[PDB]
Design a protein around this ligand. Structure first.
Ligand SMILES: C[C@@H](c1cc[n+]([C@@H]2O[C@H](COP(=O)(O)OP(=O)(O)OC[C@H]3O[C@@H](n4cnc5c(N)ncnc54)[C@H](O)[C@@H]3O)[C@@H](O)[C@H]2O)cc1)N(C)C(=O)N[C@@H]1COCC1(F)F
Ligand SMILES: C[C@@H](c1cc[n+]([C@@H]2O[C@H](COP(=O)(O)OP(=O)(O)OC[C@H]3O[C@@H](n4cnc5c(N)ncnc54)[C@H](O)[C@@H]3O)[C@@H](O)[C@H]2O)cc1)N(C)C(=O)N[C@@H]1COCC1(F)F
Lengths: 140, 140
C-alpha cells in the first residue's frame, strides 16, 4: 500500500508528476501514480481506493490544473474526485505549485474549496534538489 | 566532461529535460543540463563548449520546440545555436519526440535542417522505463 498518491492533470503536469515519482522513490517512499500502479479492473474503484490508502496526497498544480474541476458539480472530473477523496479522508495534502495561478475559492466546487487552505510548495526549476528536500519534509 | 548534453525549450520541455537528466544519471552518464552545470562566466562560450564536450546531444522536441528557430538566421536562438554546434561537430544527435510535429525542412534555417535526418525516440508516458532503456541504447 503506497505512502504517496500523486494526482495530476495529464495535459499539463504529466512530466512533473513522473519527475516527482522518481525522486520520491529514490528517497524511499512508495508512490502511486496511475501509469505505474493503476492495473486491472474497474478503475473508478481502484483509483478511489488508492487515494484512501495513501498517507500523503501530492497534488501537482500545473497551469490550469483545476480548470476542469470548475462547475463539475456532478463530480465527474478525475482530479476533482481525487481531491474530494483526499479531503474527505483527512490526508496530508501537499500541493506542488508549477506556474499555477491561485483562483478565487468561489470558482471551485464547495466540496474541494478547502484544498487551497493547505500550504503549497513552489516547484523551482533552478533549485530542484532543494525543492525535493522540502517536499520530503512535508511528507509523513 | 559530461557525456550527454540536453538541449531543450524551457517553456515546454523543462520537466521532460529534467526527467531525462535524472534517469541518465541513474544509469551512469555524466549529463550537462543548464540549470545544474552552467556556472560562472560568459554563458555563450560556456554553452557552446559544453555541446562540444559531450559525445551525445539529446534534443527534447516538445511541441513547438523549433518554432523560435524559424527565420532565426542571425542565429540568436539558443536551441538553434546548440543544434548547429552539435551538427557541426558531428555529434551523436538523439531527438526525443514529445508531441512534436515534424516541420517541412524549408521552414528551418539551412544550417540546422539536417537535424530532421536523425532517428528520433518517441517519449511514452505509459512506458517510460522502456523509453529510457531505448535512449540508453542510442547513447555512446
Ligand atoms: C480513465 C483514465 C484515467 C483518468 C484519470 N486518472 C487520474 O486522474 C488524473 C488525470 O485526469 P486527467 O488529466 O483529467 O485525465 P483525463 O482527461 O480524464 O484522461 C482521460 C483519458 O484516459 C484514457 N482512457 C479513458 N478511458 C479509459 C479506459 N477505460 N482505459 C484506459 N484508458 C482510458 C483516454 O485517453 C482518455 O482521453 C490523475 O491524477 C490520474 O490519477 C486516471 C486514469 N484511465 C483509466 C487511464 O488513463 N488508464 C491508463 C491505463 O493504465 C494506466 C493509465 F492510467 F495510464
Ligand atoms: C541566457 C540563458 C540561457 C538561455 C538558453 N540556454 C540554452 O538554450 C535552451 C533554452 O532555450 P530557451 O527556452 O529559448 O531559453 P530562453 O527563453 O532564451 O531563456 C532566456 C531566459 O534566461 C534568463 N536569462 C537571460 N539572461 C540571463 C543571464 N545573463 N543570466 C541568467 N539568466 C538569464 C531570463 O529569465 C530569460 O527569460 C537550453 O537547451 C539551454 O541549454 C541556456 C541559458 N541563461 C544564461 C540562463 O538561463 N542562465 C541560468 C543561470 O544558470 C542556470 C541557467 F542556465 F538556467
Amino acid at each position: 500500500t503506497p505512502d504517496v498518491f500523486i494526482s495530476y492533470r495529464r495535459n499539463s503536469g504529466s512530466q512533473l508528476a513522473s519527475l516527482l515519482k522518481v525522486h520520491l522513490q529514490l528517497h524511499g517512499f512508495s508512490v502511486f501514480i496511475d501509469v505505474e500502479k493503476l492495473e486491472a479492473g474497474k478503475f473508478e474503484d481502484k483509483l478511489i481506493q488508492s487515494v484512501m490508502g495513501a498517507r500523503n496526497f501530492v497534488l501537482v498544480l500545473s497551469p490550469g490544473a483545476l480548470d476542469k474541476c470548475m462547475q463539475d458539480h456532478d463530480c465527474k472530473d478525475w482530479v476533482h474526485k481525487e481531491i474530494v477523496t483526499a479531503l474527505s479522508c483527512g490526508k496530508n495534502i501537499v500541493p506542488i505549485i508549477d506556474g499555477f495561478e491561485w483562483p478565487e475559492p468561489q470558482v471551485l466546487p464547495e466540496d474541494m474549496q478547502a484544498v487551497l487552505t493547505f500550504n503549497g510548495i513552489k516547484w523551482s526549476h533552478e533549485y530542484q534538489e532543494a525543492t525535493i528536500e522540502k517536499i520530503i519534509r512535508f511528507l509523513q
